[PDB]
């Protein structure tokens, strides 16, 4: 009749209230890591069963006609397998932060760099802290990094990584070929994929890879630099030049280190900036739904714990079942039409799932055509003026478009239970607590997210 | 072959890092609701297996003696059944707060009052808000209340509940015979049990039931009143007297409403204050482990979202499987002894589980006796001066007692998966992330927490 019943994990914040609930099963099928999909893949089979009024727990309310939950279908989708972490060994990341900030952002740092072969050195302020004890605290939890005390300030310690990079490579990590400046809130959706894409650049030539800010006035203010929030990559030959002229470039005031880095490369590096539009600085505040639901290639995120608030750790939970590259992938399904037999015009309805972010139900009215939304255009949902984001984020759609209704279910909870990942999307409607659960039926032993790469730093 | 393996629900904050892990099973056998238990019930069989080093996810690390997780036993523990919610109908609770604060505290309010027969009226500030919409917003989620607009200020709205109570009882709730003043952070561990205990009072006589602050200086400052945060109970005959002298008592400044209520009863009520020590105002800051792990009869809690921080919603999650009365119940187990065959002295260890709060491993040194801790004496763990709390909280013990080591695993996560509740206790040790999981195997259909009282407010 049905298709073992998996019980949803429910915190009391979700178990206690009454809720309108529906669930769908998605079965990830892993293909090549180099496989490519559409920005919005279609599912031509019914997906979301009708909602069921539930009471405390999962008890079916007596308001429902059917006394039971609907039988949800299993939707097979193709996902690109995770890339190998072998190419990550050539990377050495550098941070200017504190051990307290590393501990607060530990889960996000574990997803980005944990269970990879990349090295991390951190310039921390001067203190009485036991660096060996703090280093063991993070390494035993899965984050192998090197803590180095520095007398410089945070702004100077950022550029001070140039000297820290060179000495660490010369003395401890000679196999390093790529060096990377990062913020502690620079979140990599798939670091091994980035390491694989760095192979296209000659390792023996100088290279300066980064991204511009999405806000045009930030580029006007600070110049065409690699904004440090999105991540910066500097090849070893360019680092050798930066070390040669470190004393001539390093100021000791409050100039942003990423701007100082770009100006030093512009002056003595003879290396142009290589632009990676997949790295996102996120120089924007408010609702970031448009960028996350854009279907664009997103390899790094930023500002998610300051300028705006977004649990990127909760968002990447699905990677344990469907791989890293499945995060923020878009599927469209459940297209329904409600025609008026007198006028012939119809109100159309369809769903778009941004994996790990949102479930959006779109309603086109009688006067709204089918192509009213180009989902390859980025919806402008943030606060700043949209004119400064047209150049970087392409042609922007309006947040409030006439004739279009956008009901959004934001991801509230996510849990890994065995081989499955339970996604708990929630919309707080006036008529109740609306819940949409997506259970990803991942393969045995895990679908990725570094679950098999625990001994990859050994020996 | 272990004694159907239940996979633990893991958020990415717990799935990503490496961790030292252990789990024990607890099967609550439900007995009579009036059954009493010791403040520290013994478990005489081994409970906690040896710790297993786990990598990312639940992968058994090669840094382990055995390649598999141990088979943990199932501990049978007697728990008292939840009381009936019939006696809650006589209660009418009054709040002086806003719809925004009700929304932020909705889960805790749902556990306290949801799925009971008690009424709730709230005096909210004047605004253009659609009161009927907000009422439907909370009622559809499980919290039925009446929102009344009031021009009075906050302190006046609290005592203004005297008029709001009398009018609501006379016109909408005539069956109300107990009226209760509460804060929005007044948390009830078992409201039906409190409603049952209120039957011990003659319902036709004036009654003023409350609790004094634990800090003696707060009583010296504001008097021997029923402190509002712990919850105040006023019988209907006393409310009639309070309404007769409302104008003579109600001021218009910033006098605390609970002190104003007590002073009005003192001047016109002719009713002494009946002290309930089980209601705790929680007039303390810092680590509140001593009160929560005291084994004392705790029926109301307060200040858990302001003066101190404690997710009382996560704490009561186990009540879905072991009943409301199991929360904060204590069990001691795993008494181990490590003697020295030369001197004969021994180092002894044992565990004390405060259900839903903490797992503490005590270590007594060679010169510490077995009676070194009276677990009926409240450990002084909060910030303020201990002398001000000796009267209310009995003889206190020191947080740092010589020869006694206290390693505490605090409750980090809690989930209800079908008939089971998973408790995720966490201690952040210098050598790694330490996790002890307790899986409560509740009975079929849920162990309580109002899972069967969903249709109890029907007409
Ligand atoms: O790797 C980092 C990133 C930031 N910060 C500190 O955090 C502040 C805010 O940085 P955030 O990343 O939130 O915003 P940004 O400066 O990137 O716009 C900075 O001014 C620094 O003082 C730090 O110590 N280390
Ligand atoms: O039922 C309540 C309780 C508190 N507050 C607000 O919260 C403040 C204090 O919060 P809390 O109740 O945690 O502290 P307490 O007053 O109990 O010491 C009050 O001054 C009010 O502004 C409120 O609006 N409604
Ligand atoms: O080079 C500075 C650059 O990092 C800018 O500084 C701040 O304006 C904001 O962090 C970012 O846009
Ligand atoms: O009646 C006043 C009483 O509520 C006291 O006021 C504050 O000191 C704190 O809320 C509590 O101790
Ligand atoms: Mn940053
Ligand atoms: Mn309060």
mmCIF file of N, CA and C and ligand atoms in Angstrom, chain A residues 183-185 229 302-303, ligand 5:
data_model
loop_
_atom_site.group_PDB
_atom_site.id
_atom_site.type_symbol
_atom_site.label_atom_id
_atom_site.label_comp_id
_atom_site.label_asym_id
_atom_site.label_seq_id
_atom_site.Cartn_x
_atom_site.Cartn_y
_atom_site.Cartn_z
ATOM 1 N N UNK A 183 38.072 35.034 5.684
ATOM 2 C CA UNK A 183 37.449 35.434 6.935
ATOM 3 C C UNK A 183 36.996 34.190 7.693
ATOM 4 N N UNK A 184 36.788 34.348 9.002
ATOM 5 C CA UNK A 184 36.290 33.222 9.782
ATOM 6 C C UNK A 184 34.840 32.884 9.458
ATOM 7 N N UNK A 185 34.125 33.771 8.764
ATOM 8 C CA UNK A 185 32.775 33.496 8.290
ATOM 9 C C UNK A 185 32.725 33.291 6.779
ATOM 10 N N UNK A 229 35.931 38.644 2.082
ATOM 11 C CA UNK A 229 34.841 37.837 2.607
ATOM 12 C C UNK A 229 34.505 36.652 1.721
ATOM 13 N N UNK A 302 29.205 34.393 2.756
ATOM 14 C CA UNK A 302 29.813 35.332 3.687
ATOM 15 C C UNK A 302 28.716 36.172 4.326
ATOM 16 N N UNK A 303 29.059 36.794 5.456
ATOM 17 C CA UNK A 303 28.221 37.745 6.187
ATOM 18 C C UNK A 303 26.965 37.113 6.774
HETATM 19 MN MN1 LIG C 5 33.717 38.493 7.262
#
